[PDB]
Design a protein around this ligand. Sequence first.
Ligand code: NA
Lengths: 254, 251
Amino acid sequence: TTPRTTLITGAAGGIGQALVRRFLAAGDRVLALDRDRAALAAFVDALGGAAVAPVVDDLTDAARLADALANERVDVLVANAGTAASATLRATTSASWRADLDANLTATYVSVEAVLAGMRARRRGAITIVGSVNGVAALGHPAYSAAKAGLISYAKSLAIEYGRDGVRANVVCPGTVKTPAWEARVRQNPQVFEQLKKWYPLDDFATPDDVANAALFLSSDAARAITGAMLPVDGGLLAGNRVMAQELTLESFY
Amino acid sequence: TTPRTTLITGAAGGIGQALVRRFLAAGDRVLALDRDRAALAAFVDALGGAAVAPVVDDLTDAARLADALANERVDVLVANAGTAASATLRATTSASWRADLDANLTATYVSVEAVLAGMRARRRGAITIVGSVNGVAALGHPAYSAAKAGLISYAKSLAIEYGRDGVRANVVCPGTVKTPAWEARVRQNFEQLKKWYPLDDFATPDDVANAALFLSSDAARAITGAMLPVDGGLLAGNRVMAQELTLESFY
Ligand code: NA
């Protein structure tokens, strides 16, 4: 008789806002978590009085977060916080390597640990991690990629250990999605997006809404038998390489 | 304005019937294809006048099936036909090996080729293949498993070649499924199988159908070439071995 409660991290970012809007549309109470207080408050204002409550937290302390959530009973975690730092190993430092691991892998561990006890107590929980195709194939951003590969491992570890408690854990792996994370690259090469279309079999990129739709599905009773899964939402990117296939077959693929 | 048309193969089996019911519930006109005419007749009768039409076909002839579909505009194919013959390589013969390849891999090729040209001409199609966890990990039924691994490859080949035509191709991989036949077998005595599954329960036919429906929908319009396990966590690892390696209980 009360709304399902969903905690969504990185809520003020491009995919995060789409996640919040989609789960709100599905009838959830959404706890929108972001480290950026001003950006989060503005998004909450824009939502117009929805069933949303902001949480300002940087995902470095699970016990602090759990205490902040003491009046809530979180049924679903969408673990979406985490951005890439260095784009190549050449550009990577030990510090930026460690920082990408903390922000993209350990932040998710912290998010899970803040809500997992209640899920297990109620024998009901869905953990839906937003990963990346970079966690599966070498495409750049190497510390980020290693962290996102670790998230796939972590989802599977969660799945086998807590499935007996009715908790499911899955990873959605987006390809290129148009978010503010691309602003610097678009300013450097304004044709980056059109040059990228050739790699994608669907000749277009997933949108933030497309990612949110997959997260909603995996978080729902329509996926109650799905756990430990990696679902790419990537316009077909991980299936292969249609640009190389065209060169290999001398037939038109794109 | 007219209903989306979905072709579902192996429609009279446990998973196939759940697929037909789920897609009918979603508003589709469903073409229910099965080799067993009497089973199709019984199923159509049980559906009670829904937007369903039977197709009796054994998936050995793509042209024959395409012509049977000449007055249809199939938008979605759920390729579900195919069962396993031999349980082990010891039990397998060259003939049973080839028969499993034809029934579980080429039958899907035939099903796709019967509808793909129209999907391309209309720039709209979703191909949703029902595979198996056996196509990903070695669990027995070896020719079946090789065929099901081939289906994952075939979906990826479809995805990269026909994405430009607005056609998507994906694979749902079930583990053990609680079909009516399975329930009847279990009622004869199988609880030793639950230990392998993290969710401590098996997928139902409707669970598989829900995944097929999602992948066939606009909510998955950016998903192609994907393998989605509907397996209660079976492919994630091995919680029985994990218990022995960690000396802690996992179930
Ligand atoms: Na292939």
